[PDB]
Design a protein around this nucleic acid. Structure first.
Ligand code: MG
Lengths: 507, 136
DNA sequence: GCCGCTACGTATC
DNA sequence: TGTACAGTGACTAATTATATGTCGTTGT
DNA sequence: ACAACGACATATAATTAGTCACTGTACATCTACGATACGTAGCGGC
DNA sequence: TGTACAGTGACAAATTATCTGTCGTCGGT
């Protein structure tokens, strides 16, 4: 290869040598050039042989030949190899696994071996630091390494299968993940609840935020189904959100790229994807999806750090007043966060581009305007009970609840696929296999509960209590084990009440 | 000044885009260089002595005739192409009264005591512009 | 001996 | 007036690669 | 007789190992745990 | 080729307390 070297910051001594060399650039004659050397021996206080060496160092190296080169020992240690290897490997072994041995502690191991070997000059602690110095800088550099980024309109998202998805247009690849927000919220009475969970759905081509879910609720395939329908259906917000632009963003993904959480690698999301026709994919590392992870830092920096009750990004940065200074309820935080996403965030510049907004790039990036899906066809979000069998008397058993259906007595002994809503299990949609296809059969209803609404977690909590209470299984008996625990509080029920009040304001 | 010196010294090797007819054949280290510590370093690095008229004709024969002449649009690259074409195929092909037989280029060539050997490109890196800090 | 509802083990955010 | 140890500048002693002479040798 | 180079001896700052006073920072209850999912095994009713 | 925003060196333009002349004036010789 090519091998060049250039001098810099030359002057401090070297300008005197440079002026000597400038006076000597030409072998004018054998008589005169010797006189020029013997004259230069007045500017440098040195013999003819020192000036002849200077001229040879200049002619063979150029300007660096004026500068004094560093000694051959620079960076080598005089303590001998035994001690240099003993010190280096002792450090490394002592920082193996969970151990975090300090150089001082390494020096103690040096004095201990020197005592065993009857040495008299075990390296001093100051020299231990020096010997370990280079392998500490490396560690600090290896943490600090920057990565460039996708540049221009071309982007290839890596999957855990080793295949890359080429992101060609708007709605080609959506991405989803969940985060705690960093604000403690209060109930409608001003008492502490908990820090909400935020879910976002991001389109990869435009980096526009296509939908959210905010709530005290837990990450679940239910929270993912709710984030998807909010992302997919056209969006409407009332004037109490004070929006000055529209979240005009909707339509159905072709692919959905996610982390490894049990919300996403689940039969429920696979059944949503198969019915909507999108393919799920697994994110290879938490650094391939910066398109979803960086929006969460932006919100901490642009929104949540400026709100009362802020908790910091971690326990070492927690404002000590966070538990006393909480003010907002979930309905206030959503009314702030939705505004932020519609008026600010989707209207800001797409950073890879510099000359489009995130929304402008989404809208212009559709291959065609998609047709809105009827809200009834978002039933696919219903969970499926895969293989329950019809009992004689036209009956089905589910979650202790017993169901009756309009044609269902025709199919006693047969197998039926039951589609149900975890928010309301009073009613069950019954499908059956025929010609190796599902066909709709009937809207079965929990007998004697046709006037009544049970969510799955209520029927489940009532069943747990009923099992442990030792009472019999029936539709009312389960309702009876709901209505007292309803009427009679526990943080999850208090959270659920505030979350419900937000869902009411959605209607 | 150091960039103008680098060009001068190195082989030219111009692209097809300049649509030149003649080759710009000069290259090489001088014995002296006269100018308007840095240039004196360069002189000491390269081995020549630093000391501290084609304008009349550039005006008359090229510039006063171009778009945007300051008494239409023209980019810097276009102006360079025009200037190189003028210098390689006209100015250096001209004959002065004091030369008679030989052109500016021919007399240059004709007067060399020997064909110099090209300085490898890297030895001229000291001329180029520098950004002092970047992170890999 | 066969079948809807509970309960324990394992994995990941 | 908290507390006491690991890490750090300012300085010095030990080691050494290196610049400086002086002269001999060779080429011109 | 003058210029260049080496064999050898000699003085010299560059680099490192060691010393010591001044000083930044953790000790100050605290992440193992909660919340989903699948996958499999089990209890009595039929 | 993760990502995208808050903060930061390097440099150009507008403003100002300050340095330099030039002459006039006052004091000393
Ligand atoms: Mg996740």
């Amino acid at each position: 290869l090519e091998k060049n070297v250039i001098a810099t910051q030359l002057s401090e001594e070297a300008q005197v040598k440079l002026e000597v060399i400038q006076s000597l650039l030409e072998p004018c004659d054998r008589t005169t050039y010797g006189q020029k050397l013997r004259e230069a021996a007045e500017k440098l206080n040195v013999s003819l042989r020192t000036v002849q060496r200077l001229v040879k160092n200049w002619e063979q190296d150029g300007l660096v030949g004026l500068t004094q080169t560093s000694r051959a020992d620079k960076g080598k240690h005089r303590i001998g190899e035994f001690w240099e290897n003993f010190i280096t490997k002792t450090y490394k072994e002592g920082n193996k696994g969970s151990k975090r041995m300090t150089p001082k502690q390494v020096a103690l191991r040096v004095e201990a071996k020197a005592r065993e070997l009857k040495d008299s000059k075990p390296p001093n602690y100051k020299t231990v630091l020096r010997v370990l110095a280079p392998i500490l800088e490396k560690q600090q550099k290896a943490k600090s390494i920057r990565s460039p980024g996708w540049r221009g309109t071309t982007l290839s998202v890596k999957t855990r299968e080793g295949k890359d998805l080429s992101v060609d247009y708007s709605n080609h690849v959506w991405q989803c993940d969940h985060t705690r927000v960093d604000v403690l919220l209060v109930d409608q009475h001003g008492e502490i609840l908990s820090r909400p969970w935020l879910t976002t759905v991001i389109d990869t081509y435009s980096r526009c935020i296509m939908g959210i879910n905010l709530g005290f609720d837990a990450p679940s395939s239910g929270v993912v189904a709710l984030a998807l329908r909010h992302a997919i259906l056209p969006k409407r917000y009332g004037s109490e959100y004070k929006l000055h632009c529209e979240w005009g963003t909707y339509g159905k993904p072709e692919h959905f790229y996610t982390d490894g959480g049990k919300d996403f690698r689940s039969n429920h999301l696979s059944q949503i994807g198969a019915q909507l026709g999108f393919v799920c994919h697994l994110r290879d590392r938490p650094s391939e999806g910066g398109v979803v992870e960086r929006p969460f830092k932006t919100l901490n920096d642009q929104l949540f750090s400026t709100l009362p009750g802020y908790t910091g990004s971690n326990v070492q940065e927690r404002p000590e007043d966070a538990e006393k200074d909480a003010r907002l309820t979930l309905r206030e935080l959503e009314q702030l966060l939705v505004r932020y996403i519609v008026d600010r965030y989707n209207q800001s510049i797409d950073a890879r581009m510099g000359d489009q907004t995130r929304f402008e790039r989404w809208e212009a990036g559709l291959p065609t305007v998609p047709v809105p899906i009827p809200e009834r066809d978002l039933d696919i979000c219903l969970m499926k009970q895969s293989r329950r069998t019809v009992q004689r008397g036209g009956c089905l058993q589910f979650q202790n609840l017993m169901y009756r259906g309009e044609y269902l007595a025709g199919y006693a002994g047969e197998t039926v696929n039951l589609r149900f809503d975890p928010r309301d299990i009073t009613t069950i949609l019954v499908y059956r296999q025929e010609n190796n296809q599902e066909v709709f059969l009937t809207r079965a209803h929990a007998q004697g509960l046709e006037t009544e609404q049970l969510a799955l977690d209520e029927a489940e909590a009532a069943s747990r209590r009923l099992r442990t209470a030792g009472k019999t299984i029936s539709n009312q008996s389960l309702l009876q084990e709901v209505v007292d625990r309803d009427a009679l509080k526990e943080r999850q029920k208090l959270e659920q009440t505030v979350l419900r009040s937000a869902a009411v304001d959605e209607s």
